[PDB]
Amino acid sequence: GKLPPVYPVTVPILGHIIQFGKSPLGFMQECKRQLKSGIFTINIVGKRVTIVGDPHEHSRFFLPRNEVLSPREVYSFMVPVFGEGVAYAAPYPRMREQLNFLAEELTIAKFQNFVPAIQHEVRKFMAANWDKDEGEINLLEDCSTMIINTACQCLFGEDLRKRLDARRFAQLLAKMESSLIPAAVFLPILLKLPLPQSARCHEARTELQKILSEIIIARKEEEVNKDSSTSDLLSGLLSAVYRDGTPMSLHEVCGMIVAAMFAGQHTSSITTTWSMLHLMHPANVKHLEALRKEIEEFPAQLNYNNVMDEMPFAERCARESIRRDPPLLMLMRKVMADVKVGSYVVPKGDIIACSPLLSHHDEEAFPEPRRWDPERDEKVEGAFIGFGAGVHKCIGQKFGLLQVKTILATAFRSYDFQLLRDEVPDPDYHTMVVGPTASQCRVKYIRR
Numbered sequence: 001g002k003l004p005p006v007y008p009v010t011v012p013i014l015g016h017i018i019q020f021g022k023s024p025l026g027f028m029q030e031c032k033r034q035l036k037s038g039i040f041t042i043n044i045v046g047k048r049v050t051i052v053g054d055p056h057e058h059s060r061f062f063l064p065r066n067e068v069l070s071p072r073e074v075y076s077f078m079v080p081v082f083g084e085g086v087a088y089a090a091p092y093p094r095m096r097e098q099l100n101f102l103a104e105e106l107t108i109a110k111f112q113n114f115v116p117a118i119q120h121e122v123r124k125f126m127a128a129n130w131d132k133d134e135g136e137i138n139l140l141e142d143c144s145t146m147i148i149n150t151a152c153q154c155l156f157g158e159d160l161r162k163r164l165d166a167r168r169f170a171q172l173l174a175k176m177e178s179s180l181i182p183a184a185v186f187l188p189i190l191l192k193l194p195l196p197q198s199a200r201c202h203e204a205r206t207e208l209q210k211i212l213s214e215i216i217i218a219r220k221e222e223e224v225n226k227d228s229s230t231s232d233l234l235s236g237l238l239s240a241v242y243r244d245g246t247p248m249s250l251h252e253v254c255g256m257i258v259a260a261m262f263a264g265q266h267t268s269s270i271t272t273t274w275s276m277l278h279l280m281h282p283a284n285v286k287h288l289e290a291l292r293k294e295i296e297e298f299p300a301q302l303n304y305n306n307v308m309d310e311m312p313f314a315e316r317c318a319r320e321s322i323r324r325d326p327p328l329l330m331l332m333r334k335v336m337a338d339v340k341v342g343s344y345v346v347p348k349g350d351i352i353a354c355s356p357l358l359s360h361h362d363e364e365a366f367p368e369p370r371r372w373d374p375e376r377d378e379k380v381e382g383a384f385i386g387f388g389a390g391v392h393k394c395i396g397q398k399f400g401l402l403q404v405k406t407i408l409a410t411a412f413r414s415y416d417f418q419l420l421r422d423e424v425p426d427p428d429y430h431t432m433v434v435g436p437t438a439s440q441c442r443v444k445y446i447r448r
């Protein structure tokens with residue numbers, strides 16, 4: 001009656017999923033062009049997915065309440081990692097309380113200490129691995145390693161870090177990441193079947209929870225004497241009290257730690273990696289010299305004020321990396337009730353989606369979208385959705401960018417880099433969180 005245009009189904013069981021796999025951006029643009037409409041419906045394994053692909057209409061996706069546009073069903077596949085009743089799996093008011101508590105642990109007030117702590121970890125890394133006059137590295141692997149160290153330095157007590165060090169924490173997160181199946185969104189039977197991948201999620205989460213409980217017990221054994229107990233993400237969340245007067249359970253605390261550490265790890269690593277890749281490319285020398293000018297007068301020891309107040313260009317670099325190659329390609333909700341978007345009604349039962357990948361390549365909002373240009377601004381309000389928006393906007397943005405900017409400032413003060421390829425790497429769309437193709441990320445570092 002008032003449905004968006006349906007892109008024709010020509011291969012029935014998997015309507016558009018194979019073409020989407022082959023070229024996510026190419027596919028979606030072709031739907032947009034052929035149907036002459038930013039708002040269109042594709043068919044994924046038999047499920048209607050209505051894409052809100054017109055930037056002018058972003059608010060119709062991001063602003064409706066959970067009860068109308070629901071995130072629970074689309075995050076169901078992450079329950080084995082977050083836990084039953086945690087985050088999106090909890091009743092919505094309780095979901096928001098949990099997410100709010102997490103947000104409060106990532107506030108700007110803590111950054112006074114985070115900045116030197118982060119730089120210290122970075123400098124430790126570089127000293128140990130970038131210690132030659134010049135050397136070849138995988139930049140993606142190395143940025144990932146730095147982000148695990150910097151994040152854990154900020155958010156984990158030293159006792160926790162001893163128990164769960166960078167190597168072990170990486171392995172744990174990797175076991176989780178490699179064992180999740182986003183396809184379960186469209187093949188919900190997967191969540192009910194015996195799968196090795198589900199078992200592995202349970203093992204990893206159980207290992208983490210065991211470690212947390214041992215740390216909690218040890219702190220309680222030792223605290224009365226200390227006069228100075230450990231303050232970290234774990235202790236913060238443990239002291240949270242819900243509006244009904246009850247504390248978070250360890251189960252919930254573990255899940256929220258999984259959520260934070262998982263969320264921050266890949267996105268922040270990938271963002272740092274893309275930024276450095278672009279900045280070291282010849283097409284972008286004007287931009288590199290803009291970064292080197294920004295940071296030229298900084299102390300050897302970055303402080304809060306340097307990073308928070310005096311790095312607007314470095315931040316523009318991070319943001320435009322996410323603009324061009326957003327780590328999260330597709331944001332989704334389940335439609336619980338009919339919703340107006342543009343000239344259309346999206347029916348109850350649809351999955352509705354808003355794709356940072358598609359929207360970031362709308363040529364009205366972002367002319368020449370495959371050009372990386374940190375000096376661009378959007379020409380359509382709210383077109384940039386790299387960190388989402390509205391009800392579920394990213395709560396980790398500032399902390400993520402804090403780490404990115406600190407690495408950029410620290411790396412480029414002491415090194416140049418040469419990309420060992422003519423072009424900036426292709427994005428690799430095969431993974432949950434999309435980064436540059438790992439095998440294309442070998443670079444030469446050169447000490448200054």
Ligand code: HEM
Binds near residue numbers: 071263393395397401
């Ligand atoms: C570093 C680059 C980052 C990018 C590009 C990014 C991107 C996003 C996006 C697109 C969303 C929206 C999800 C949706 O609409 O369904 C989101 C939400 C979220 N992000 Fe991030 N994020 C980043 C860093 C972080 C970090 C460092 C953390 C935690 C330390 C974090 C934690 C979260 C959480 C908890 C949510 C859910 C918010 C809610 O549901 O209300 N993110 N992020």
Ligand SMILES: O=C(N[C@@H](Cn1cncn1)c1ccc(Cl)cc1Cl)c1ccc(-c2nnc(-c3ccccc3)o2)cc1
Binds near residue numbers: 262267330433
């Ligand atoms: O990593 C995921 N979610 C993360 C996103 N994140 C927020 N900041 C940093 N990352 C996440 C979100 C909320 C919370 Cl609290 C914890 C996490 Cl850790 C995630 C990745 C991919 C998908 C996904 N599901 N379906 C797709 C998809 C569907 C069609 C085409 C392409 C992708 O992608 C879902 C979740």
